[PDB]
Design a protein around this ligand. Structure first.
Ligand code: HEM
Ligand code: HEM
Ligand code: HEM
Ligand code: HEM
Ligand SMILES: */[SH]=c1/[nH]nc([C@H]2COc3ccccc3O2)[nH]1
Ligand SMILES: */[SH]=c1/[nH]nc([C@H]2COc3ccccc3O2)[nH]1
Ligand SMILES: */[SH]=c1\[nH]nc([C@H]2COc3ccccc3O2)[nH]1
Ligand SMILES: */[SH]=c1\[nH]nc([C@H]2COc3ccccc3O2)[nH]1
Ligand SMILES: S=c1[nH]nc([C@H]2COc3ccccc3O2)[nH]1
Ligand SMILES: S=c1[nH]nc([C@H]2COc3ccccc3O2)[nH]1
Ligand SMILES: S=c1[nH]nc([C@H]2COc3ccccc3O2)[nH]1
Ligand SMILES: S=c1[nH]nc([C@H]2COc3ccccc3O2)[nH]1
Lengths: 146, 141, 141, 146
């Protein structure tokens, strides 16, 4: 992706203050809560019929920690999310059959999670930068279509 | 349609936002204009500038239309028929754009009310905006 | 909602397809299963095989539900409430899948009726299926 | 993309019989007719308020001939739609700001156009192959996100 020096900066400045232990399970939990059909990919996770059951689910938090792990890689190779997520792109696209639309969903729930935590600090320009990265990452995950 | 709990959550959020409705509406638009510049091509003769007064003014119109939606949750198709005509027939708004404004309404909400923006509320507000958005693009169907 | 012309086009297409309704419904499904294999994970205990009888049988159920939609164009939300519950609440069908079946209904139609599948009819049938699809995913809102 | 030898074959066998002078303007005209919001990218084209006015519009047919031209390139470099459409990907993604969703729309209207012309010859397996290519091409157009 292409971010101005100001965006590239605000994004890493923001990320550095991200609780990587929680933020990922929260974005994943909100995705599953808010868009119930996504719960179908995680049946092994258990009863996801209530929001509190989804959010406190240890497997949801564990797995969520990996997802955040990926976005972190992205912010580390913004101009290479092509290869960085290349492997994942195959996982999600080739083996799983996740509709790219759902990648867009998750990415935007992440943005809302970030806004939920940084409040007013998540200014329009700052949100604008993340939509950029999030858009990049989702594109990379969809990238590999073999 | 919205459950009784969903209705209660949306109103709770509507009551809590209270006076800031028009402002949040202007912010969600500023947010949408910046994150999805493509959306700006729908407001050509507009000063999409920051402190813009035209934006401040459209934010209020949007929040009012939403408040009207809240008061006709079980009526919306009706209550919004005019708006549905404006946006679907005369304006030809790409339906994807409704997901983008709604997503921006939620960020605005979430950013000003971190603590109340719980997963359940998020869930309720999401269903609401999608009902609104679906009514507004209903003239394409 | 559907214009008077749109209603007339959909019925014209419904009348012309007549007896082939269940068959076209099975074909659209076979087409959907093959082009978007992901959709198959919703029919696990099904013989998604070709000449499958379970598919032949679901095609008919789908066509009947559609015929019911045609008879309640101005009612649908009601007339499909049950179906909307099945697919949205109990089945958790990804809304994108409705665009995929609908797209497959149209191919089937188009392939068996090349000459009647004019741009206007295509337009009318598209609006119809999207109305149906929107009613079926309405329990997510 | 990855097609079985049977799909790769059916696709070229099919394409060879495609009236490249008409099929493209028809897919484009149906897109504009059926999804009216897409008419906003082609204002210079004139009054598109009726289906017959859209379909007979000379600029719609001309331009449509180019779009088909592109898909033809794709069927010629299925395992390289990455670079083949690379240039276009920038045009549509970087300069235009077309939402990738609309790429999906156009591609599927093309499939319907093909079904409109080949009737029963456009069998499920045959449609299945084109959804593949069409999915590839749309992915390539979305590929470049700079
Ligand atoms: C931008 C969005 C996404 C990112 C960055 C992402 C990231 C990840 C990562 C890091 C893994 C773990 C890989 C490993 O452990 O080696 C993974 C696995 C997976 N992802 Fe995602 N993912 C994304 C979106 C989605 C969406 C929308 C779905 C919903 C269908 C999904 C379904 C899965 C599944 C089923 C797995 C494996 C689950 C399991 O271990 O049981 N992902 N994802
Ligand atoms: C949450 C859904 C939305 C709501 C509640 C909403 C509300 C409104 C309202 C209240 C008006 C005034 C109508 C009148 O005075 O007759 C308006 C106008 C308009 N809306 Fe929306 N809108 C929504 C989404 C969108 C989106 C997604 C776009 C496009 C990106 C958009 C573009 C427009 C435009 C271009 C106008 C006309 C502006 C002008 O030229 O004065 N709206 N909308
Ligand atoms: C055009 C929109 C659709 C229509 C009119 C339709 C119609 C129907 C009908 C008539 C039934 C029988 C319900 C009953 O007997 O109570 C059914 C069941 C079902 N539908 Fe749909 N459907 C549509 C879209 C979809 C889509 C997109 C999927 C998923 C890819 C889907 C998955 C199912 C499943 C899994 C069942 C249950 C099958 C079983 O286990 O017996 N449907 N549908
Ligand atoms: C898989 C889908 C698509 C393909 C293969 C495609 C192909 C093409 C090609 C070959 C060109 C001409 C480039 C040149 O002359 O150098 C072009 C231009 C363009 N495309 Fe597409 N396109 C696609 C989808 C879309 C969609 C959905 C839109 C709708 C917003 C769109 C809007 C445009 C515009 C605005 C131009 C230039 C129009 C003009 O010359 O006035 N395209 N496209
Ligand atoms: S706060 C929240 N939760 N979900 C979402 C939206 C974000 O906007 C959006 C755009 C395109 C596709 C999916 C999607 O989910 N916002
Ligand atoms: S025959 C016809 N015309 N338009 C369409 C559909 C095809 O299905 C589809 C899937 C995903 C996104 C857009 C879309 O438009 N079918
Ligand atoms: S996993 C993945 N990524 N892209 C794709 C295919 C299918 O769907 C699609 C939707 C919109 C634009 C391009 C594509 O190509 N699968
Ligand atoms: S032109 C283009 N292609 N991809 C993109 C961005 C924005 O939208 C999007 C939607 C679904 C998956 C990935 C992306 O990334 N712009
Ligand atoms: S696919 C599908 N179905 N419904 C949605 C989402 C995406 O966009 C939204 C954005 C904000 C609120 C609700 C929303 O509905 N995405
Ligand atoms: S018609 C048609 N096709 N796609 C839609 C979208 C419009 O905007 C939405 C926004 C949020 C949720 C669902 C939505 O349905 N409307
Ligand atoms: S974005 C948007 N809004 N409405 C649509 C289309 C896409 O999928 C369809 C597929 C077949 C018939 C109608 C359809 O509605 N795409
Ligand atoms: S809720 C929600 N989000 N997106 C939708 C889709 C469902 O399927 C459709 C199928 C065709 C046209 C519009 C459609 O709206 N419903």
């Amino acid at each position: 992706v292409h971010l101005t020096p100001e965006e590239k900066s605000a994004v890493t400045a923001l990320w550095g203050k991200v609780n990587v232990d929680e933020v990922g399970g929260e974005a994943l939990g909100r995705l599953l809560v808010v868009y119930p059909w996504t719960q179908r990919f995680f049946e092994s996770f258990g009863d996801l019929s209530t929001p509190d059951a989804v959010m406190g689910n240890p497997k949801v938090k564990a797995h969520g920690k990996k997802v955040l792990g990926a976005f972190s890689d992205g912010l580390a190779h913004l101009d290479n999310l092509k290869g960085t997520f290349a492997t994942l792109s195959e996982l999600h696209c080739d083996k799983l059959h996740v509709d790219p639309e759902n990648f867009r969903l998750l990415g935007n729930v992440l943005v809302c999670v970030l806004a939920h935590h940084f409040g007013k600090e998540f200014t329009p320009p700052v949100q604008a930068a993340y939509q950029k990265v999030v858009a990049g990452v989702a594109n990379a995950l969809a990238h590999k279509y073999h | 349609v919205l459950s009784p709990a969903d209705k209660t959550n949306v109103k709770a959020a509507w009551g809590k936002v209270g006076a800031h409705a028009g402002e949040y509406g202007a912010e969600a638009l500023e947010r949408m204009f910046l994150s999805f510049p493509t959306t700006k091509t729908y407001f050509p003769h507009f000063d999409l500038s920051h402190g813009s007064a035209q934006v401040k003014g459209h934010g209020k119109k949007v929040a009012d239309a939403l408040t009207n939606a809240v008061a006709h949750v079980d009526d919306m198709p009706n209550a919004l028929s005019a708006l549905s005509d404006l946006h679907a027939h005369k304006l030809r708004v790409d339906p994807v754009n409704f997901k983008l404004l709604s997503h921006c309404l939620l960020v605005t909400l979430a950013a000003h009310l971190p603590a109340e923006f719980t997963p359940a509320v998020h869930a309720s507000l999401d269903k609401f905006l999608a009902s609104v958005s679906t009514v507004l693009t209903s003239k394409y169907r």
